[PDB]
Design a binder for this molecule. Structure first.
Ligand SMILES: COc1ccc2c(c1)C(c1ccc(Cl)cc1)=N[C@@H](CC(=O)N1CCC(N(C)C)CC1)c1nnc(C)n1-2
Length: 127
């Protein structure tokens, strides 16, 4: 029933880059999803205490959210685009694992995921 520490957004030991693909993930992909009418449940870690979800972190062992992704992109946490794409996919999958088909929160995740897929289809070739 308590909240865990949030995912890591800072680790000096971890080697970093700023590739053209990572810049597209911030300027196009994250920005498009963040401004959407359905973004709000996904803009910060799940607060299992205030939402009264005492089983959330029993079921979900790899939590992820767009607040964490935004910080990772803005503070240059990643080496490559695949690491960041994996974080978005983990966020959607967690929502579908915890909830039921047709729930409001699932419809919201599906709308954001459709846009994610349309933008990643045009990921530029790495320069
Ligand atoms: C800050 O508010 C949040 C954050 C994360 C959420 C949720 C809400 C919203 C939420 C629900 C409806 C609408 Cl319209 C919008 C959101 N859902 C939660 C899930 C949720 O509360 N329950 C209600 C109680 C249920 N019993 C235990 C069976 C489980 C599902 C959630 N799941 N992933 C994320 C992200 N989320």
């Amino acid at each position: 029933s308590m909240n865990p520490p949030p995912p890591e957004t800072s680790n000096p030991n971890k080697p970093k880059r700023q590739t053209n693909q990572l810049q597209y993930l911030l300027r196009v992909v994250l920005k498009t999803l963040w401004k959407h009418q359905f973004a709000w449940p996904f803009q910060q870690p799940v607060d299992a205490v205030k939402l009264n979800l005492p089983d959330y972190y029993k079921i979900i062992k790899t939590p992820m959210d767009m607040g964490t992704i935004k910080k990772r992109l803005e503070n240059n946490y990643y080496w490559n685009a695949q690491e960041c794409i994996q974080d978005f996919n983990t966020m959607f999958t967690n929502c579908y694992i915890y909830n039921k088909p047709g729930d409001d929160i699932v419809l919201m995740a599906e709308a954001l995921e459709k846009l994610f897929l349309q933008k990643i289809n045009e990921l530029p070739t790495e320069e």
